[PDB]
Amino acid sequence: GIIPKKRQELMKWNGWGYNDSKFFLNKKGQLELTGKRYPLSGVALPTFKDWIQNTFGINLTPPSIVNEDFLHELKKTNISYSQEADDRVFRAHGHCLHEIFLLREGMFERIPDIVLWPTCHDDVVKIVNLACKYNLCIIPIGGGTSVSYGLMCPADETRTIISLDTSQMNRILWVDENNLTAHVEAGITGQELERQLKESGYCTGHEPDSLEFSTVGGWISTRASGMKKNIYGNIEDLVVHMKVVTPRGVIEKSCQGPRMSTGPDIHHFIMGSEGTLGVITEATIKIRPTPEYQKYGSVAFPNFEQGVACLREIAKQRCAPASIRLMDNQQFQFGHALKPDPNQLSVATLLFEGDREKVLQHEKQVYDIAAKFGGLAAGEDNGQRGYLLTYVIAYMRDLGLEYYIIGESFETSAPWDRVVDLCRNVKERIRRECKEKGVQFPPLSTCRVTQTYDAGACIYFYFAFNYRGISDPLAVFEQTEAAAREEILANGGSLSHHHGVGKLRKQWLKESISDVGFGMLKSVKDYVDPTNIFGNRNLL
Amino acid sequence: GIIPKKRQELMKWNGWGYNDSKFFLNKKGQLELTGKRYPLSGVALPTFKDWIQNTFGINLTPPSIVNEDFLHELKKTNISYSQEADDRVFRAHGHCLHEIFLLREGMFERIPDIVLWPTCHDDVVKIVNLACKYNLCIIPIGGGTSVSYGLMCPADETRTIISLDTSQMNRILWVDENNLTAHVEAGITGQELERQLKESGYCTGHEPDSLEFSTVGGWISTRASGMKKNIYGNIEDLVVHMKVVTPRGVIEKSCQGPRMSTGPDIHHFIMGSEGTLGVITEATIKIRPTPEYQKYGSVAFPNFEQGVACLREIAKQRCAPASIRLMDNQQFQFGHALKPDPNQLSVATLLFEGDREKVLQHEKQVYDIAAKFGGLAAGEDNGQRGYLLTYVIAYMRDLGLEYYIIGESFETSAPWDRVVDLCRNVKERIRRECKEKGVQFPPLSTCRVTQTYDAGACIYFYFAFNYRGISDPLAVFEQTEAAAREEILANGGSLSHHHGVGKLRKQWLKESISDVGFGMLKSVKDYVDPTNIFGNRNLL
Ligand SMILES: Cc1cc2nc3c(=O)[nH]c(=O)nc-3n(C[C@H](O)[C@H](O)[C@H](O)COP(=O)(O)OP(=O)(O)OC[C@H]3O[C@@H](n4cnc5c(N)ncnc54)[C@H](O)[C@@H]3O)c2cc1C
Ligand SMILES: Cc1cc2nc3c(=O)[nH]c(=O)nc-3n(C[C@H](O)[C@H](O)[C@H](O)COP(=O)(O)OP(=O)(O)OC[C@H]3O[C@@H](n4cnc5c(N)ncnc54)[C@H](O)[C@@H]3O)c2cc1C
Ligand SMILES: C[C@@H](CC(=O)NCc1ccc2[nH]c(=O)[nH]c2c1)c1c(F)cccc1F
Ligand SMILES: C[C@@H](CC(=O)NCc1ccc2[nH]c(=O)[nH]c2c1)c1c(F)cccc1F
């Protein structure tokens, strides 16, 4: 569960995930997943090949530029470091499509010059003090799962870029059973954090799809959201305290009290900072007893529209289960094609978790509400296989890439009264833009509602196309994604619910938060990091 | 429910509340409240006189300095304004003890020079533009309920001080029944907001003790907390959107989505700004159906310690009702003395509110948990009279002042494992400090736990003494309150849970949030308001 230093030894150098986990054609000509790692690993998927065919119409290094005096002082600290090509290349990207192409099919313009692996807070203080002295530039990395060009090195950056890798600064420091909090180093992965806490009968319940690699410090940096937010909260709810190293000095509140009125909350100044202000070294997170019991479920609806109305009503009654998600028809068919009126029909997956008794009180209320929108209980299996699926979806990018298929997921949050219109108009905008740019086959564009809130919902989109017969396929993707974002904003959706801005969405930020607001962010950046040491150039 | 312009016509010029509501000795020599306004209004309180005697051992204008050219432009806007003494004196204070003495028994050093009453957002833009041009200073006021010297005018402030009164900028702009949000002007009072919304079947549930006068813009400015937070949230939870006028310009997010990842959340840059960055003019707040049903309750415990352990356990199981509060023994006796082992015994009051059916499921779980800490159901009456009492407590300051008794309430939040020790040591610190400073009778110092959180609790303290026979009684109070704050911090409590900092707690802020953090606040202030127009000098 700890990420090793030489990452390529466990993980794919050119795509998502673990080296031992890849999609291949088995000795029956059926798609199957390698290894023994996930539930679907080593399980043949007879309909999955047919589905890809039917849906898409297919068959089936720069040198290191580092000062020798800085390197001399760095050796005195016994902070491990590397100037090796394959380590620096690994830490120069996340998992946006364009990055993955330049990885497979060429080279990046700029990559980090040196990688450092601090192991504690004081190490990070040393590195930042060194960067002041020798005029260095720092780009923190945890899991490297950014889908916002958050880790990309600016091409015109003349200074030595340090990739400050947090993966080895990863121990749970204390578990406070009295206050139900856990004080942890920022580099720890979700999976490792949940595994260690479970041994003591606890958990956080913070479960992003990237949890195998994404870190505590990452989550704080990007305002990450988790699958079971309904119970455990998002990251802004979960974080009681943090310790941050910046060029100006160390930020840290002097007390651990649950809720304060001591001016503007400086946690929110860091939470969402996307690596531009400093290094988040330590954080105190809320824990809960390991849930007594879990149960899955599903509900089918005549159409998407009625499903949304039901989710709305569940939100209105504040009786949403741990996870509730509504798939459109194309996604329902997708999930059916992965097992070992039926064209508009939509399905909601459910996950209830908690105390044995309360879980059932909940379950009833949800199904009764669903009844009144034409919702019919559609089985415990549908639910369960739906959630196990989520940690393998990311591997399908690489599969599609073999067979001339490209695509990416994208998201927004919007008010309840804009959901239905937004989903419909964004999908339409994708079809139109594709046709106009010369795509031969109708592009796949689907959506699901992944989170409910009082004031609205999170909407998660997939879009993909067969790019065979297109002059410049990356420009087509790039331009269509940007069109979808324009449509999202025009239909009252947000710039991002949880992926954040990074460098992918910088152009919209001033509109989103206003000019004065943008300037507030800049004023902070310029106090904390006047000479731009933390110069990934995300956000501003 | 709307605050009029000439406030003194409905409200007390020299103390808390409505003119028609005062404690007096009735024609039987019993204490009674005037008027018909509260549940206890016109109800005689036979034991209350005896209690005050037993507990305490007693028997029972500067000229307006304003530019004529600015005044000329102001007349062109038809924004109402006043230079009258009694209007300016009214808006020069909140309800800290020292302010109330200077009001009754003398004069303030500095007061506002002119009062303005804008009626909308554009009016506020005009005023702030005028303050840039003629070098004016602005101190926003809503209810004037600050207990942090938040409204006090700095004595050495040479510029013309505008009291920007929000009371007339108070209309509900829309009610969005689809998104369950209400878009409101910042000057509306809680009481008026709840009344208007109830006519459409809705509420916010945000219920501070100051709700009769405190405003939406106030609550955002001070990070206000409400009695029924457990259901409805505190202000940071309730606010979906806001519009803020600052010298640099207008801040406002371009979309109304429920949850975002677009960098640091600029709402939290304003929320807690205590009138130092700008004027909050409009805000979008979460609403809920008017709760179907309410029920009160109470539980008695052998001691305070066991009550705290029970509240902790309720928090751990996340089954706290709308309100749960634990009184120490002195406060239990107090409440008993106001009706028309018993020395350590403590009592918890309960308020359950919601859907008819779910309220009872809750009720059972609370009492069963309480059973295991020696908690015996202690009646529906105790509960009900406990909560009706909270809106009359504030009127007792003025009663005590007649009979040589002074005192103030103060608060903190602390982790669960520091609650019991903090309460005991803070009370002890108050007795010791009082004795050392020459107080005749040991003072009253009591506490109650008013809110529970995952990571800790809010603790609410009263302290008071008979000041007869003391040279300088305001210095004694001042110095003791500051000693209590020292003791709070030393026992792991926070600088404030909900009253905020203002100018009362400025000296501790840098410790509380760290020096870099303090600088982050200052960096924002300086960008947004470079010439200190918003110069109440709270916080920094
Ligand atoms: C397959 C997949 C699934 C995903 N699922 C989800 C999901 O369910 N929910 C969700 O919110 N997001 C998701 N994401 C997006 C991403 O995982 C999150 O934004 C996550 O918070 C990033 O974690 P990380 O540790 O990989 O950070 P990185 O990708 O390593 O870095 C992200 C940014 O934060 C900065 N940073 C990292 N560590 C620190 C630190 N210690 N101090 C200061 N700055 C730092 C970096 O400089 C960079 O700008 C997913 C991404 C992928 C590829
Ligand atoms: C009897 C009593 C009971 C109380 N009970 C509670 C309670 O239960 N919970 C709680 O949290 N607090 C309580 N308070 C404290 C206080 O009422 C709150 O902090 C409240 O939020 C202040 O609201 P207001 O409209 O009275 O603001 P004011 O006192 O009028 O102003 C407070 C501060 O905010 C600024 N301000 C006001 N309006 C604006 C605006 N529109 N834009 C920008 N800045 C502005 C002012 O300049 C000032 O610094 C209580 C106080 C009293 C006297
Ligand atoms: C699933 C995406 C690839 C992708 O964008 N993966 C990243 C990812 C995967 C899962 C996520 N869950 C989130 O909340 N954010 C997430 C981000 C994809 C397609 F949408 C279409 C075709 C191939 C393909 F790989
Ligand atoms: C009730 C207080 C006066 C006081 O503290 N008023 C302000 C006040 C009153 C009620 C409050 N509820 C909160 O949450 N904050 C509050 C602040 C008081 C004393 F603490 C002691 C003697 C008389 C007296 F009136």
Q: What is the DSSP string of B435-474?
A: HHTT-SSPPEEEEEEEEE-SSEEEEEEEEEEE-TT-S-HH
Q: Is B350 annotated as belonging to a binding site?
A: no
- Among candidate residues B202, B460, B462, B467, the one labeled active-site is B460
On whether the CB atoms of residues B144 and B92 are closer than 8 A, the answer is no
Q: At what angle do helices A506-513 and A515-528 cross, to 10 degrees?
A: 110
**At a CB cut-off of 8 Å and minimum separation 6, what does A24 contact?**
A31, A32, A34
Q: Are residues B223 and B187 in the same domain?
A: yes
CA distances from B312 to B250, B362, B521 (A): 43, 16, 34
Closest by Cβ to B258, choosing from A456, A496, A505:
A456
In chain A, which residues have their Cβ closer than 8 Å to the Cβ of B497? 257, 259-261
On whether the CB atoms of residues A269 and A257 are closer than 8 A, the answer is no
Which neighbouring-strand residues pair with B293? B354
Q: At what angle do helices A97-104 and A473-490 cross, to 10 degrees?
A: 170
Please indicate whether, in this complex, the C-beta atoms of A524 and B528 are within 8 angstroms of each other: no
Closest by Cβ to B180, choosing from A181, A265, A316:
A316
Number of domains in chain B: 6
Q: At what angle do helices B473-490 and B506-513 cross, to 10 degrees?
A: 10
Q: Which residue from A232, A175, A170, A231 is spatially nearest to A200, judged by alpha carbons?
A: A175
From ligand 3's centre to the CA of A23, what distance in Å?
16
On whether the CB atoms of residues B535 and B157 are closer than 8 A, the answer is yes
- Indicate the residue type of B270: I
On whether the CB atoms of residues B505 and B434 are closer than 8 A, the answer is no
User: Tell me, what DSSP letter sits at residue A254?
Assistant: S
- Gaps in chain B (C to N over 2.5 angstroms) fall after 60, 340
Distance CA A154, CA A142 (A): 19
A368 CB neighbour count, 10 Å cutoff: 11
Distance CA B32, CA B52 (A): 14
B16 CB neighbour count, 10 Å cutoff: 19
Q: Which residue from B493, B452, B449, B484 is spatially nearest to B346, judged by alpha carbons?
A: B449
Q: Are residues B257 and B295 in the same domain?
A: no
On whether the CB atoms of residues A73 and A418 are closer than 8 A, the answer is no
Q: Are residues B451 and B422 in the same domain?
A: yes
On whether the CB atoms of residues B216 and B184 are closer than 8 A, the answer is yes
Q: At what angle do helices A473-490 and A419-437 cross, to 10 degrees?
A: 150
From ligand 2's centre to the CA of B233, what distance in Å?
17
Distance CA A97, CA A401 (A): 10
On whether the CB atoms of residues B352 and B297 are closer than 8 A, the answer is yes
Q: Is B21 annotated as belonging to a binding site?
A: no
CA distances from A238 to A182, A205, B330 (A): 10, 10, 36
Distance CA B525, CA B515 (A): 15
- Indicate the residue type of A25: L
A45 CB neighbour count, 10 Å cutoff: 18
Q: Which of A170, A210, A498 to mutate to test the pocket of ligand 1 (most atoms within 8 A of CB)?
A: A210
- Half-sphere exposure (Cβ direction) of A331: Cα atoms closer than 13 Å: 27
User: Tell me, what DSSP letter sits at residue B95?
Assistant: S
Q: Which of A2, A12, A97, A141 to mutate to test the pocket of ligand 1 (most atoms within 8 A of CB)?
A: A141
Q: Which residue has the tokens 């009164």?
A: B165
What is the torsional sign of CA B163, B168, B170, B173? negative
On whether the CB atoms of residues A528 and B516 are closer than 8 A, the answer is yes
In chain A, which residues have their Cβ closer than 8 Å to the Cβ of B501? 261-263
Distance CA A108, CA A14 (A): 13
CA-based R_g, chain A, Å? 23
Residue A75, class by beta-carbon neighbours within 10 Å (0-12 exposed, 13-18 middle, 19+ buried)?
Answer: exposed
Q: Which residue has the tokens 């580099």?
A: A187
Residue B88 tokens read as 């300016």
CA distances from B351 to A112, B229, B247, B248, B385 (A): 58, 12, 44, 45, 11
Shortest distance, CA B302 to any CA of chain A (angstroms): 22
- Nearest ligand 1 atom to alpha carbon A498: 11
Residue A316, class by beta-carbon neighbours within 10 Å (0-12 exposed, 13-18 middle, 19+ buried)?
Answer: middle
From ligand 1's centre to the CA of A501, what distance in Å?
11
Residue B21 tokens read as 């509501």
Q: Which residue from B235, B142, B148 is spatially nearest to B410, judged by alpha carbons?
A: B148
Nearest CA in chain B to A453: B258
Atom 7 in ligand 2: which residue has the minimum CA distance? Answer: B208
Residue A46 tokens read as 């007879």
Long-range pairs, B426-429, Cβ under 8 A, ≥24: B426/B461, B426/B484, B426/B487, B426/B488, B426/B491, B427/B461, B429/B483, B429/B484, B429/B486, B429/B487
A174 CB neighbour count, 10 Å cutoff: 10
Please indicate whether, in this complex, the C-beta atoms of B500 and A250 are within 8 angstroms of each other: no
Nearest CA in chain B to A275: B263
Q: Which residue from A183, A235, A181 is spatially nearest to A210, judged by alpha carbons?
A: A235
Q: Are residues B174 and B277 in the same domain?
A: yes
Residue B321 tokens read as 């009702």
From ligand 3's centre to the CA of A469, what distance in Å?
24
On whether the CB atoms of residues B498 and B225 are closer than 8 A, the answer is yes
Q: Which residue from A389, A395, A391 is spatially nearest to A15, judged by alpha carbons?
A: A395
CA distances from A58 to A394, A403, A407 (A): 21, 7, 15
Shortest distance, CA B495 to any CA of chain A (angstroms): 7
From ligand 2's centre to the CA of B298, what distance in Å?
30
Q: Are residues B65 and B144 in the same domain?
A: yes
CA distances from B384 to A57, B195, B294, B295 (A): 70, 21, 10, 8
In chain A, which residues have their Cβ closer than 8 Å to the Cβ of B180? 316, 454-455
- Half-sphere exposure (Cβ direction) of B10: Cα atoms closer than 13 Å: 10
| 3 state SS for B314-356 | HHHCCCCCCEEEEECHHHHHHHHCCCCCCCCCEEEEEEEEECH
B232 has catalytic annotation: no
Distance CA B540, CA B507 (A): 9
Q: Are residues A29 and A127 in the same domain?
A: no
Q: Is B144 annotated as belonging to a binding site?
A: yes
Residue A325 tokens read as 């998600």
Using the CB atoms, write b or e for B66-80: b if 16+ within 10 Å: bbeebeeebeeeebe
B122 CB neighbour count, 10 Å cutoff: 12
- Coil, helix or strand at residue B534: coil
Distance CA A432, CA B9 (A): 65
CATH number of the domain encompassing residue B187: 3.30.465.10
Q: Which residue from B264, B261, B255 is spatially nearest to A147, judged by alpha carbons?
A: B261
Using the CB atoms, write b or e for B187-207: b if 16+ within 10 Å: bbbbbbbbebbeeeebbbbbb
Using the CB atoms, write b or e for A266-299: b if 16+ within 10 Å: bbbbbbbbbbbbbbbbbbbbbbbeebeeebbbbb
Q: Is B57 annotated as belonging to a binding site?
A: no
Residue B506, class by beta-carbon neighbours within 10 Å (0-12 exposed, 13-18 middle, 19+ buried)?
Answer: middle
Distance CA A332, CA A323 (A): 17
On whether the CB atoms of residues A216 and A173 are closer than 8 A, the answer is no
Q: Which residue from A176, A194, A296, A190 is spatially nearest to A241, judged by alpha carbons?
A: A176
Residue A155, class by beta-carbon neighbours within 10 Å (0-12 exposed, 13-18 middle, 19+ buried)?
Answer: exposed
In chain A, which residues have their Cβ closer than 8 Å to the Cβ of B528? 516, 519-520, 523
Q: Are residues A11 and A46 in the same domain?
A: no
Nearest CA in chain B to A365: B358
In chain A, which residues have their Cβ closer than 8 Å to the Cβ of B521? 263-264, 266
Give the alpha-carbon dihedral of B372, B376, B377, B383, to 10 degrees. Answer: -100
On whether the CB atoms of residues B230 and B324 are closer than 8 A, the answer is yes
CATH number of the domain encompassing residue B523: 1.10.45.10
Q: How far apart are the first and last CA of chain A?
A: 34
Domain boundary (B169, B185, B201) is at: B169
Q: Which residue has the tokens 């309100």?
A: B323
Q: Which residue has the tokens 């018909």?
A: B36
Q: Which of B146, B152, B273, B459 to mutate to test the pocket of ligand 2 (most atoms within 8 A of CB)?
A: B146
Distance CA A485, CA A412 (A): 9
Distance CA A277, CA A522 (A): 10
Shortest distance, CA A152 to any CA of chain B (angstroms): 17
CA distances from A294 to A84, A322, A351, A496, B352 (A): 46, 10, 7, 30, 28
CA distances from A404 to A126, A241, A333, A470 (A): 47, 47, 22, 11
Q: Is B34 annotated as belonging to a binding site?
A: no
Residue B229 parent element (H or E)? helix B229-232
Distance CA A102, CA A534 (A): 24
Q: Is B215 annotated as belonging to a binding site?
A: yes
H helix intervals, A293-408: 304-316, 329-336, 356-371, 380-388, 396-402
From ligand 4's centre to the CA of B392, what distance in Å?
10
Q: Are residues B109 and B247 in the same domain?
A: no
Q: Which of B145, B167, B494, B532 to mutate to test the pocket of ligand 2 (most atoms within 8 A of CB)?
A: B145
Distance CA A148, CA B187 (A): 40
Q: Which residue from A128, A141, A138, A148 is spatially nearest to A215, judged by alpha carbons?
A: A141
Please indicate whether, in this complex, the C-beta atoms of B260 and A361 are within 8 angstroms of each other: no
Distance CA B382, CA B384 (A): 6
Q: Which residues line ligand 1 (CB under 6 A)?
A: A 16, 94-95, 139-147, 150-151, 166, 186, 208-210, 213-215, 217-219, 221-222, 224-225, 274-275, 279-280, 394, 498-500, 536, 538
Length of chain B: 540
Read off φ and ψ for residue B448, nearest 5 degrees.
-145, 150
* Beta strands at B293-301 and B376-377: parallel, antiparallel or unpaired: antiparallel
Using the CB atoms, write b or e for A402-437: b if 16+ within 10 Å: eebbbbbbbbbbbbbebbbebbebbbebbeebbeeb
Q: Are residues A7 and A140 in the same domain?
A: yes
Q: At what angle do helices A419-437 and A304-316 cross, to 10 degrees?
A: 140
Ligand nearest to the CA of B398: 4
Shortest distance, CA B274 to any CA of chain A (angstroms): 7
| DSSP code string of B165-209 | E-TT---EEEEETTTTEEEEETT-BHHHHHHHHHTTTEE-----T
Q: Which residue has the tokens 């410790």?
A: B511
CA distances from B193 to A476, B94, B211 (A): 51, 22, 10
- Indicate the residue type of A531: T
Closest by Cβ to B454, choosing from A258, A265, A268:
A258
Which neighbouring-strand residues pair with A327? A347, A448
Residue A128 parent element (H or E)? helix A121-133
Which neighbouring-strand residues pair with A451? A458
Ligand nearest to the CA of B187: 2
- Coil, helix or strand at residue B80: strand
On whether the CB atoms of residues A146 and A222 are closer than 8 A, the answer is yes
Using the CB atoms, write b or e for B431-459: b if 16+ within 10 Å: eebbeebebeeebbbbbbbbbbbbbbbbb
Please indicate whether, in this complex, the C-beta atoms of B524 and A522 are within 8 angstroms of each other: no
Using the CB atoms, write b or e for A104-142: b if 16+ within 10 Å: eeeebeebbbbbbbbbbbebbbbbbebbeebebbbbbbb
Distance CA A84, CA B9 (A): 79
Q: Which residues line ligand 3 (CB under 6 A)?
A: A 95, 147, 209, 393-394, 396-397, 400, 407-409, 462, 464
In chain A, which residues have their Cβ closer than 8 Å to the Cβ of B252? 514, 517
- Indicate the residue type of A231: I
Q: Which residue has the tokens 């899991």?
A: A143
**At a CB cut-off of 8 Å and minimum separation 6, what does A465 contact?**
A56, A405, A406, A407, A434, A439, A441, A443, A444, A476, A477
In chain A, which residues have their Cβ closer than 8 Å to the Cβ of B539? 263
**At a CB cut-off of 8 Å and minimum separation 6, what does B469 contact?**
B438, B440
Q: Are residues A156 and A179 in the same domain?
A: no
Distance CA B504, CA B415 (A): 23
The CA angle B473-B477-B478, to the nearest 5 degrees, is 115
CA distances from B41 to B14, B31, B45, B467 (A): 20, 11, 10, 29
Residue B495 tokens read as 């600088």
Residue B117 parent element (H or E)? strand B114-117
CATH number of the domain encompassing residue B477: 3.30.300.330
Distance CA A17, CA A31 (A): 18
Domain boundary (A391, A409, A444) is at: A391
**At a CB cut-off of 8 Å and minimum separation 6, what does A381 contact?**
none
Q: How far is CA A474 from the centre of its chain?
A: 22
Residue B101 parent element (H or E)? helix B97-104
Q: Are residues B2 and B143 in the same domain?
A: yes
Q: Are residues B308 and B346 in the same domain?
A: yes
Residue B110, class by beta-carbon neighbours within 10 Å (0-12 exposed, 13-18 middle, 19+ buried)?
Answer: middle
User: Residue B38: which domain range?
Assistant: 20-60
CATH number of the domain encompassing residue B362: 3.30.70.3450
Q: Is B212 annotated as belonging to a binding site?
A: yes
